[PDB]
Structure 1
């Protein structure tokens, strides 16, 4: 009977043993409420402390998730491959969503440990931390892991552009639960002074926005930002009023007064709100974080150059083939791409991102030239690879590299990595590289357990080894802020600085390199702004 006393009462979890002998059992407390239910009047309001419970709360099962709908159309390119490919299994977790969803789960190994807090996210529309089991890395690394479910969708990110609905409510739930962890993880044997928060995809964007938030001050010390950033085109919504008014239109309270319209939208059922389709601009988001002046006073890059996040230890990275779905729709059975298709895709990308400025033709020709392998011009498979690389560099690699440059500007510890490995399975085509979300199983130690319903890949021994080393780096950074100390591998991960640009090649043979795709990074960072107004 694993029991823990907290500032709000006692709760009992369950001790679960891992299938493999080598790692010992972990004690998991499932569904701990961190805030008062955001229901009724609390809707579209900052979270508030949860009420106390007198007895001993049973924490063994999974509370209902926040209102979300996977069948509703969402930007497919954003969601991780293991999510869309296994939507069927996703349905088992996502069934029975409820508005009262502000809960978290804890996994504790059997002095004080670091505390990892993982923020999930698919598209700011769906997702839950209920998917992932934090047991395995907790057991191997001897770290306390927490998973969290926060308000999502309209209830989580609706904004009216004013005091009627400031928005950014998901971030508020995250800081509220981070405060909960800071105040109460010492009860579980954790180290409040050693707290790190990490996420993949959109969750990484949430974390990166948190390090730029004044409200996040003092709660956490380190962070990991995986395959995400606050500078991406789909990170922060710059036109909230338009989509908010569109939603208000569809549900039938469009009124002139924003306060009256939100008092309307409090009455409607959450099922109606989620079931709506609102299609934003391609490679943009409809409902998400907005520049409110309180949580995010200004544009992300502004807060970056100002120097808020220089006091945190940050490790971040990208994957080689993130933008798989940018090209999956056009690939022929010959595993190649025709020149007409290449031109069509590049032109469409320019149209979507840059919205027809002056000098568009020069930019289009420059992009076509820069991502064409002139040593193998005629080859279609190389065309497919470069068409992947275009989206992968522009959407993921460049913002993350800019982030790293802005962090280590004054010598603050920073680490950069590129994931060059992935499982083999049927969820993804064989010709693909490591796409979006394929690093997730390794960091959470799926290879130690083997194939599961969410990750049915055929795992080999090399998969287990790479899972071990990557999770070891993660835990070492959590404990010391150094991926190399105190536990050694049985290669040293050097620090990243703006002139050396030292990064870690993670793969079957990990190593140290420099200037990760520096040419394309500089092309996007420097040359592209000059061509157009």
Structure 2
């Protein structure tokens, strides 16, 4: 049977799922590691002990314990991101979508969800791999990893909570793919990992880490990068937040042992409730427990690794969305509303700047503010709002990714950059928010192909176009189909620095993606903050 597959860990029973007037094989909820529960909370993952019999992989697995956003109850805009399955520490499972008939050895794509390392699921509707798997005849895998303290609490030195375990749960699933994806008709030698936001960062991080480089062929990074200011913390900061978490839960902070002895006895929700209390500053686009530069998973600092070319050299495709900042302003900046144009007064604008660059000293805040203020019209509400969006977006996503793309292209074997700027005709979020962070996902997973979702023809066209770039890229290391006749997406070069739009209009090649502001964020500001 096509739905029965024997893996090195045991037999698995898939399920035939319908997809666009046809069907395909789906092996959902396959375990790749032992349930990281009890004495195992915070510890690195352990490969799943082989099981006897046939594992039922027909339903979706549970979602890792995480903070659930309830800012907008019943609003599909936000709940589309909340866990749609039961929450449980036992959550290290992976889902697979195999074409039917099963291909012999085709291109595989592994999805690493985002969520700022504090949330995320592999089972969200917007991550349904059938449409992509089916349409571009690829074996699509959707892994999972621990978020929050569970996946990133870091007491460096300790082996009971070494940190980056979540990043390890990812490596393991990627490992399991390396060892078993062949049995599903997927070529382990053509695995392309791709993720968004924290997922994008995670991707870049596996490029960086020596311990992951041989676990994939190519990589796609979406609105995220290893060097994103929120993507990680030092060992000192990590420890500080672990002890702070402890202090928040009347934990014995006298030894790395009993601090964890304590954390392991607390119910998951207890940790989640006091999770954000350990952040250093009042802010936005900052998350409590994230990857830590331990010196093992990350040999040296991310900057030094990027400058020395100490990272996997392959081809990479990546880009950002036009309005990467609105989502975060809506949630944490004063003046923003889901029910109005969100015109920001000069006073809120400044509250936002400070909330956006919490680590900057007053001279820095002044630099930022000056850089994003139109002094000819400083009290324009629309301009302040759009400014904050660019600040948050430029500082947290776009510029860090551009620094990465520039640093990487000097050693890589090919770079393809995009700028998604298409606002869905059915978006439920208000207009002011534009092309929000993460809303390119649905286009990558083919959601516009589902007529019920109420998308427009042109939008179906864009999605089909994107899925193909991604697929073709994962398959050849080049978004462009050979001899093809449409406009070619130029390779990003250190000299030309070309990228393309991603919308329903004819493709436009561009250059130096927001080089002006990124020169500020990547070079000037860093120097100002280090000097002063």
Distance 1:382 1:489 in 2: 41
2:84 corresponds to 1:93 = yes
Distance 1:411 1:127 in 2: 29
Aligned to 2:145: 150
The offset of 1:334, in angstroms, is: 5.8
CA RMSD of aligned residues (A): 2.5
Q: 1:335 and 1:99, CA in 2 relative to 1: closer, same or farther beyond 3 A?
A: closer
The offset of 1:135, in angstroms, is: 0.1
Cα deviation digits, residues 494-517 of structure 1 (max 9, x gap): 111111101111111222111111
Aligned to 1:114: 107
Please identify, of 5-14 and 171-180, the stretch whose mean Cα deviation from structure 2 is larger. 5-14
Q: 1:466 and 1:88, CA in 2 relative to 1: closer, same or farther beyond 3 A?
A: closer
Distance 2:326 2:490 in 1: 30
Q: 1:82 and 1:502, CA in 2 relative to 1: closer, same or farther beyond 3 A?
A: farther
Q: 1:319 and 1:156, CA in 2 relative to 1: closer, same or farther beyond 3 A?
A: same
Q: 1:365 and 1:83, CA in 2 relative to 1: closer, same or farther beyond 3 A?
A: farther
Contact 1:236-1:285 at 8 Å conserved across structures? no
Structure 2 counterparts to residues 428-467 of structure 1, below 5 A: 428-452=429-453, 458-467=454-463
Contact 2:64-2:87 at 8 Å conserved across structures? yes
Q: 1:257 and 1:60, CA in 2 relative to 1: closer, same or farther beyond 3 A?
A: same
The offset of 1:34, in angstroms, is: 0.6
Please identify, of 184-193 and 288-297, the stretch whose mean Cα deviation from structure 2 is larger. 288-297
Distance 1:367 1:401 in 2: 18
Where 1:214 maps in the other structure, the secondary structure is coil
2:328 corresponds to 1:337 = no
Aligned to 1:318: 320
| Structure 2 spans left out of the alignment, 5+ residues | none
Contact 1:26-1:135 at 8 Å conserved across structures? yes
The offset of 1:335, in angstroms, is: 5.3
Please identify, of 178-187 and 407-416, the stretch whose mean Cα deviation from structure 2 is larger. 407-416
TM-score of the two chains, using structure 2 as the length reference: 0.89
Cα deviation digits, residues 311-333 of structure 1 (max 9, x gap): 12211101110100454442584
The offset of 1:449, in angstroms, is: 0.8
Aligned to 2:512: 515
Aligned to 2:359: 353
Find 1:37's aligned residue among 35, 50, 73: 35
Q: 1:244 and 1:13, CA in 2 relative to 1: closer, same or farther beyond 3 A?
A: same
Where 1:292 maps in the other structure, the secondary structure is coil
Please identify, of 179-188 and 310-319, the stretch whose mean Cα deviation from structure 2 is larger. 310-319
Q: How many residues align structurally?
A: 511
Q: 1:337 and 1:125, CA in 2 relative to 1: closer, same or farther beyond 3 A?
A: closer
Q: 1:530 and 1:212, CA in 2 relative to 1: closer, same or farther beyond 3 A?
A: closer
TM-score of the two chains, using structure 1 as the length reference: 0.89
Please identify, of 291-300 and 459-468, the stretch whose mean Cα deviation from structure 2 is larger. 291-300
Q: 1:507 and 1:487, CA in 2 relative to 1: closer, same or farther beyond 3 A?
A: farther
Q: 1:244 and 1:447, CA in 2 relative to 1: closer, same or farther beyond 3 A?
A: same
Q: 1:497 and 1:32, CA in 2 relative to 1: closer, same or farther beyond 3 A?
A: same
Structure 2 counterparts to residues 342-381 of structure 1, below 5 A: 342-350=349-357, 352-356=358-362, 360=363, 363-373=364-374, 379-381=380-382
Distance 1:83 1:46 in 2: 36
Contact 2:309-2:411 at 8 Å conserved across structures? no
Q: 1:411 and 1:285, CA in 2 relative to 1: closer, same or farther beyond 3 A?
A: closer
Cα deviation digits, residues 247-271 of structure 1 (max 9, x gap): 2223333141212332343344334
Q: 1:255 and 1:531, CA in 2 relative to 1: closer, same or farther beyond 3 A?
A: closer
Structure 2 counterparts to residues 120-139 of structure 1, below 5 A: 120-131=113-124, 132-139=127-134
2:217 corresponds to 1:212 = no
Contact 1:247-1:278 at 8 Å conserved across structures? no
Structure 2 counterparts to residues 398-437 of structure 1, below 5 A: 398-410=399-411, 412-425=413-426, 427-437=428-438
| Structure 1 spans left out of the alignment, 5+ residues | 453-457
Contact 1:237-1:286 at 8 Å conserved across structures? no
Structure 2 counterparts to residues 263-274 of structure 1, below 5 A: 263-274=261-272
Aligned to 1:455: none
Where 2:413 maps in the other structure, the secondary structure is coil
Q: 1:11 and 1:274, CA in 2 relative to 1: closer, same or farther beyond 3 A?
A: same
